[PDB]
Design a protein around this ligand. Structure first.
Ligand SMILES: *C/C=C(C)/C=C/C=C(C)/C=C/C1=C(C)CCCC1(C)C
Length: 137
């Protein structure tokens, strides 16, 4: 596969329900759903090394990892975590997270390249799954 590209969001489902699981109050959940409508992902893949830049209108973050080696990022609601990415198949990776301090719901994410040229990202908290679909810019 090659995940590299500038990806633009075309669909986003269940994001508000994910944030509710994470304890975000109602008004901020709605504002965040609106922000996710400008969600853009820039990926550069070199083998199993990934450089990913995730951004909205006012915020941008970089996530750099190599498949199979632990790294530190943050969960969706912003708590620091230790993460480990593995392949599930040729075109799908899955990341398990574990909080660096304290307790909280079990979180994870996936990225998948479909045969139709889409990028599907999922984010999970407990048993609520958010699905976001992107196309190349
Ligand atoms: C492989 C993809 C990864 C690691 C993406 C992570 C994305 C996020 C933590 C996104 C968070 C967002 C918010 C909390 C509010 C604004 C909209 C998002 C989706 C960018």
């Amino acid at each position: 596969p090659n995940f590299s590209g500038n990806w633009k969001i075309i669909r986003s489902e269940n994001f508000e329900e994910l944030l509710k699981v994470l304890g975000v109050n109602v008004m901020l959940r709605k504002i965040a759903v609106a922000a996710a409508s400008k969600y853009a992902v820039e990926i550069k893949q070199e083998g199993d090394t990934f450089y990913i830049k995730v951004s909205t209108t006012v915020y941008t973050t970089e996530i750099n990892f190599k498949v199979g080696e632990e790294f530190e990022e943050q969960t969706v609601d912003g708590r620091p975590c230790k993460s480990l990415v593995k392949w599930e198949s040729e075109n799908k990776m899955v990341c398990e997270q574990k909080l660096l301090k304290g307790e909280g719901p079990k979180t994870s994410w996936t990225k998948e390249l479909t045969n139709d040229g889409e990028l599907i990202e999922t984010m999970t908290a407990d048993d609520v799954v958010c699905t976001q679909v992107f196309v190349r810019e």
